[PDB]
Symmetry: C6
């Protein structure tokens, strides 16, 4: 919705956004929105995501696709009316993104998803990219495990010439929808065949906000298919713009730089990761 | 409509346009158009705005969607006939923009929206842009609060990877329509995913004129998602031409330049803002 | 239609075209075509102009849209047949442009619209363009007044972020159609949003010939929205080719160069205008 | 159709093609095909030409449009079957170009159209182009008169901002069809709005062969809208490729170079024209 | 279909392919496929070729169009099923190319079409190209006659501004289909208007393989319509890759280089032609 | 589906993927998936592949197209549901790729297809490319034979101007589907006409993953149709990204570099091949 502010309510918002990253218990926002989703009436659409054509598919709170849903309207505090209809497996009335309100007045946050090695990490979309042919896949998995902490992370596989990899964009969006509905830490390998269809452009435009709203983290690899030239800089720019955090390779073997947007209008933080390989190319992120 | 002039009536027009910015009570045009809108007959379409596909959705004076409306025609002084018809929630006959006459003969104005720190600010569209990939969000909010003055400003959030941000263009235009119908000071964060769809092109083509007609100000952030190259100058040019006022970052920390189009054919004014951050990245614009 | 010539009739043609600019009473062609238009039978389509989609809307002599018109064919001297049919507000059969013969055998003219400051000015399209992003609006209005002479000039406003400006292309074509049907001197501010839709391309392609056929002058501003680079040269080139006269800014403050096509195959003339501002940015063109 | 050759029949063909340019009485081919056209059964389609959309309109021998024509097939010496159907004003079955056989075995000619100043000129398409803003219109008219000789030439006017100029492509193709059906010497002013729609591309691809097959000459002006740079060379190349003869401006005031394709695989000839202006910009081509 | 090999059966294939060019009687494959075509059952579709839109038209063994044909399926050795259905004159089921099996296991050949001047020439597509805007037409005809030997060659004329030249792509493909169905040596003048429509892209993609399968040679002229720049090398590359043999002009008057692909994976051979003109630009290729 | 991991199960995954390349019996994965495919119930869709339009055709285990198949859904461990429906020969519901589970939980492998000359080779897609326009065809055939070992390799021929070569993309996908369903070692000559249609893009995007899932190797030639310029680097880049292994030509006569992706996140290996020609251009890869 739209929100109205004066100096006082704006200062309160910024303090709450700051708290959502710096002082809330890690993963608290994810559990909060899990509760919101569990409260949703049975059969109710909760999430719509674009398929390759630019039509949207719609899911309920248990990550089941909805194929038929009679028109239903809802009136927000704003005065804005949301209408949702599903017919023949596709959204006929509605919008892409969350179809129920997960955030309320608390918008523009990068809710803390996990804390690891003395650093807090934001929910939202994390693009792992930069110069190089190689090394992003082990990093996304190492980050997945580390941010998962006590919990397993979910892996979405797409568009690589390896066994068992889905290459159909419409199964990809089904996987991502389910992942965000059910898991706090999600890895996508990779965004190669994403980066262009209407659905693919919808995904890059939508996924960060969807994830940040849920309080889950989506950790996605992106190789520059192009040279190690300076189309690299173009890829970093596009990635930075459409992600909540950016992780980029560096000059130095095994080192990565993490750039975090801590919230709307808030400080952007940077820190470095040092990593090393063990057996079978399993990567460890050093902390101590 | 079209308007006829000779030397004498043109001189009168330019005097009236000059006054609309320089001597009218700040915010007085907004109050006038609120009065015009309030006196419209119940159910009358007042505003049409393009959705992503290039079709238009239509609102009444209370910012509620008009879904069905039988063809009605109105005869202007110009002799021209305007027609409005809404069917299945979409405009079938009519034009984008204001469907009631807010201006009459008084056109080509940048009606003063507010006065702050010894400077008058124009209604219409204000694009906050320039080199850098940060700093615009705190500025748009500071400007929103400052120009709001005694009133709250409305915030429209779109297309950033942060919690609660809508990323559906059709919701965006609903938000902006409601905002202009109901508030004098409006902030958009951001124009990233705007600037391209038919609806998105319609928006940059229409919003400045819509806001100037109402006497409201729309303050919109725009990062060069492209480089800090030049690129930057292309964005400045495009922004300047399609906005009423332009606010651009400079090589001095915290300093911004404001470039105001004071009306049709009138002087373009410049002044500089100095700013600083307090707690939680809340920006203050220095004044006296 | 097509016209046949030998050396003798071609010499007569060129003499007649020459006279249409150099020796006819200024504005006499306009007065002639006004009479032709006034004598047109009631309900007759007289003008077809492209709307945004590339379809065409049709007007009668009073500038009212024709919604329904049963097929009517007309046989030319050429043996060629013209047909007009209008259905559901759109041209079903016919061509863009004037649908009645305004002039007779005399074609390829730049009929003199007015004389001012020792110089004759052509009807047709006049594009006011060149380097800089400022100064064109006051010039088009000063020209409008000066060429209007004893008569008021009509102002068409389109696609600028100021109060009262239409930003819908289909209202634009309506305005231009009414203007050319009813007035000898017309100002368009501006061509920004035209220069691309099929309707917009049609407009650039059609308006000069329409205006020259009527004997009215359309004076249109065009900024290079792009840089003050060699994009200026390209805009100038494209403008010159699709206009009857070109007015371009120069190196010298307040000075403009006017380049006039005096008719088919005839001499192109050049002269300069000197100008200055008075109060409220009202520009005067110097003469004596 | 296809044609089979051995060394002997090929030598005979080349000798006949050579004769068609060098030794036949000027304009003889035009009179021959006029006879062929006059022999055509009443109501029979003889010519199809592309309209702007890429559909084709169809004419009979008297240059009247055909709107309804029941399917009719014809078997050529080749074994190839030609089918022609017209429905609702458009070709439903058939091909663009001549729908009756004007040429027989005598194909690949540039039949002599006229002789002037000690030079033979070919039928087909003659593009008058080259560096410069100006000067092509007087040249096309001077050539028209000169090649017309005893006969008047036909003028097709299209797409210039001057009085009486058609700007609708579909009337343009109607004019050109009629001109080629009825006249040996045809001038088009200009190809500006041609050079892109399917119909426009069809015209450039078709018109030379259509004209050469008839034995008529189409003399068309083409300005480079672009600079006097070296997009000029690109325009010359495209023109040369799609015309039977090319006339290009030179370094020297009033001088033009004529480049003639004398037939299939035959010598290309060059000569120069010297010209001067009289009153009202009437151009004379010097001979003696 | 697909074919299985081991070392022994692959060696046999390469021997057979080598023989198809180097030791088979010249023109013997053509005679064989004529026999295959003659033994097809009456009414059987034998060839499908794409028309401009990308649909396909279908011919029988006598090069007559098949307009309606009930679905029929055939079981290959491969286990694969081919199906053919024609409805309203267009292929509804099937594939472009030969609809009967002309080759069996003997695939990847450049069957020798003729021997002339001590050199064997391959069937398939031969593109005659290179720098210059003249000389290709006389060469293609000289090569047609020379390779025709005891037989006449067939000439397909397309897309040049000369008398009797078809310029409709759909007639072009009918001409080429008939030519390949009925003659061993075929000349196309020219490929200008080919090289872009779906049908045109289909043609360059298909014709070489179609001709090589038949054992006929298609000799096609191609000018760089683009510059004599480099450009030229792009055309050479594109031509080489999509033809069986390439013939290119050189810096020596009258000299051409022939580059022959002798079969799948086999050596590419080169030899040079010397040529001279006689009367009426008839070119002779020097031999002994 | 999506898969969940913690540190322990991820370590097991990487160990299993490592084993799939380094220690599994060469060709064992293929033999496994053959058994899965053979045990599939009669009529079950097993493979969907995109045709030229971007629709998908569906095959059963015997490589026969499925024309009609009533909706059938299957529930995964993931909770996700897969559905297949085929109507009028096209997939109505489902995804591109394998429609049955060939492998189980083990994904992200490059299953060893064969061992030759002291080196293990991965299944999946192998693109043979690099500088030069010659030499790739003999290499793909030599690899096919060598990796075939005791078994024959299947050859898919597409889009070259030689006898018997299919040039219809839809037959191509049929051939590739049959090949992957029935053979462990597959050669495609070539990708020229693939590298763009939606089907062609689907193919590049899908085939590596399809082949790796099956445990078959597809060995595909690709010339840079463009120059031996830095376009080579771009082709190499695009090829590497969409292939499991890359084989590229070098500076040295007969020498090729093989670059193998051994599995998800695993080491990429490099080794060189030395080669020489025997009779009829049969290439041998040296070993001892
Ligand atoms: N033990 C190791 N030492 C060094 N590099 C390794 C090791 N294991 C894997 N790699 C590299 O890391 C990459 C693994 O990630 P991969 O998915 O192949 O590429 P990306 O991560 O860029 O998508 C491989 O390209 C490989 O070259
Ligand atoms: N206290 C602070 N001091 C200096 N810079 C800050 C501070 N807080 C935030 N910023 C900067 O201001 C930006 C906030 O606006 P943001 O939305 O991130 O970018 P933009 O405003 O350009 O869209 C951040 O990029 C951050 O780097
Ligand atoms: N009194 C003045 N002195 C100098 N410049 C002026 C004066 N009044 C207006 N201008 C300039 O002339 C322009 C008026 O025309 P405008 O419509 O703003 O641009 P354009 O004419 O290029 O469309 C303004 O940009 C302003 O900078
Ligand atoms: N008497 C003259 N002396 C010199 N130049 C002339 C004379 N008359 C006309 N011209 C030039 O010739 C041109 C006439 O042709 P025009 O149609 O205007 O351009 P184009 O022929 O290139 O289409 C004019 O541009 C004008 O500048
Ligand atoms: N007798 C001749 N001597 C030299 N050149 C000739 C002779 N006859 C024709 N030519 C050249 O050969 C060309 C004939 O082929 P043409 O169709 O015009 O071009 P292309 O063959 O490249 O399509 C002409 O351009 C002409 O310049
Ligand atoms: N015996 C040989 N010696 C040297 N080069 C050869 C020999 N046989 C064939 N070649 C070259 O190898 C190529 C065979 O592969 P081909 O299919 O023609 O090209 P590509 O393999 O690049 O698709 C030919 O271009 C030819 O020039």
């Amino acid at each position: 919705m739209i929100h109205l502010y004066d100096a006082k309510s704006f200062a309160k918002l910024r303090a709450a956004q700051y708290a959502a990253f710096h002082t809330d218990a890690p993963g608290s926002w994810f559990d909060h929105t899990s509760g919101v989703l569990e409260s949703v009436e049975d059969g109710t659409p909760v999430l719509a995501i674009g398929v390759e054509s630019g039509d949207a598919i719609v899911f309920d709170k248990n990550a089941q696709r909805i194929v038929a849903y009679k028109e239903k309207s809802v009136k927000a505090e704003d005065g804005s009316v949301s209408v949702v209809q599903v017919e023949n497996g596709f959204m006929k009335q509605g919008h892409r993104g969350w179809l129920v309100d997960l955030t309320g007045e608390l918008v523009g946050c990068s809710p803390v998803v996990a804390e690891f090695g003395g650093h807090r990490y934001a929910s939202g979309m994390v693009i792992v990219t930069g110069k190089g042919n190689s090394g992003k896949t082990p990093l996304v998995h190492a980050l997945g495990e580390a941010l998962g902490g006590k919990d397993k992370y979910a892996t979405v596989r797409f568009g690589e010439p390896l066994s068992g990899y889905n290459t159909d964009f419409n199964v990809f969006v089904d996987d991502i929808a389910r992942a965000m509905l059910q898991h706090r830490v999600i890895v996508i390998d990779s965004l190669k065949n994403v980066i262009i269809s209407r659905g693919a452009f919808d995904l890059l435009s939508d996924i960060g906000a969807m994830a940040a709203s849920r309080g889950c983290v989506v950790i996605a690899s992106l190789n520059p298919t192009s040279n190690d030239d300076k189309i690299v800089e173009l890829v970093k720019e596009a990635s930075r713009a459409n992600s909540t955090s950016l992780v980029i390779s560096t000059d130095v073997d095994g080192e990565w730089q993490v750039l975090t947007r801590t919230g709307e209008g808030l400080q952007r933080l940077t820190h470095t990761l040092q990593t090393s390989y063990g057996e079978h190319s399993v990567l460890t992120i050093h902390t101590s």
